[PDB]
Amino acid sequence: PQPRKKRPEDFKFGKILGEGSFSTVVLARELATSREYAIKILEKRHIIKENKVPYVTRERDVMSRLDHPFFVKLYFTFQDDEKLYFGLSYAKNGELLKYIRKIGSFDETCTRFYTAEIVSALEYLHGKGIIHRDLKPENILLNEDMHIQITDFGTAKVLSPANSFVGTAQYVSPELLTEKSACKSSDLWALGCIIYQLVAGLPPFRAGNEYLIFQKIIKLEYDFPEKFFPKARDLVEKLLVLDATKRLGCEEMEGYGPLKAHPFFESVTWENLHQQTPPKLT
């Protein structure tokens, strides 16, 4: 068996950590243990009306299948007459994006560290035939110890052999704008954008509106500031490649081995990133 199903009364709900069109995430403290969980709450009525059952169900299933230190863990689920609740691990420090603004940009040791954590998280995710499809600084959280915790699998795609979704405009891959489709490489593209954002302080493709943004993406219109770490620049250039089959890290390019072997990660020990002490953020 297992611990009896939990119920709302077992918690003392606190502040709202964030909202979505889909639901609300609130910080809660379980009375019997004093443990803090970030509980995602969804209104069954709203979900049904919006035809999101498949999405919510997929989200819960992907999360249940993940058991890694770089991913928010799902501890339990329960529901009452009107709402569904998902008990997720609480990452106190919030969005990686906050830290990016807070300090402007990351030095080389910090960029390397956090990129390595993300790459390693991606290898794990892709190893299970799962595609995030909306990877970005706002979806990458930080736990109390400053290690990453990736979440929000509401837009995830589970492979079985991935065109029904888009994702945040600035991180969308060109294939999604053209062949109306997506694969593992799509996340790798988002990685390229993220890396670039860690070093430069802003995402690569920026413009007045979505349309302009998409124009630049399909034309690969962007450039590096003259201060950009050379090896990071080289790595980014191998990720922000229009042809999805030529991005460092994808199946056609022989996987994660070559990606992790990149010069930019020279001094990284991949086997125990999570045991390592994250570099102080400036």
From Swiss-Prot:
The chain holds residues 72 to 359 of 556 of the full protein. The lineage of its organism: Eukaryota, Metazoa, Chordata, Craniata, Vertebrata. Appears to be expressed ubiquitously. The keyword Transferase applies. Belongs to the protein kinase superfamily. AGC Ser/Thr protein kinase family. PDPK1 subfamily. This is 3-phosphoinositide-dependent protein kinase 1. The modification Phosphoserine is found at S164. Phosphorylation on Ser-164 in the activation loop is required for full activity. PDPK1 itself can autophosphorylate Ser-164, leading to its own activation. Autophosphorylation is inhibited by the apoptotic C-terminus cleavage product of PKN2. Angiotensin II stimulates the tyrosine phosphorylation of PDPK1 in vascular smooth muscle in a calcium- and SRC-dependent manner. Autophosphorylated; autophosphorylation is inhibited by the apoptotic C-terminus cleavage product of PKN2. Homodimerization regulates its activity by maintaining the kinase in an autoinhibitory conformation. The 14-3-3 protein YWHAQ acts as a negative regulator by association with the residues surrounding the Ser-164 residue. STRAP positively regulates its activity by enhancing its autophosphorylation and by stimulating its dissociation from YWHAQ. SMAD2, SMAD3, SMAD4 and SMAD7 also positively regulate its activity by stimulating its dissociation from YWHAQ. Residues 42-86 are annotated as: PIF-pocket. Transmembrane segments: none annotated. The modification Phosphothreonine is found at T277.
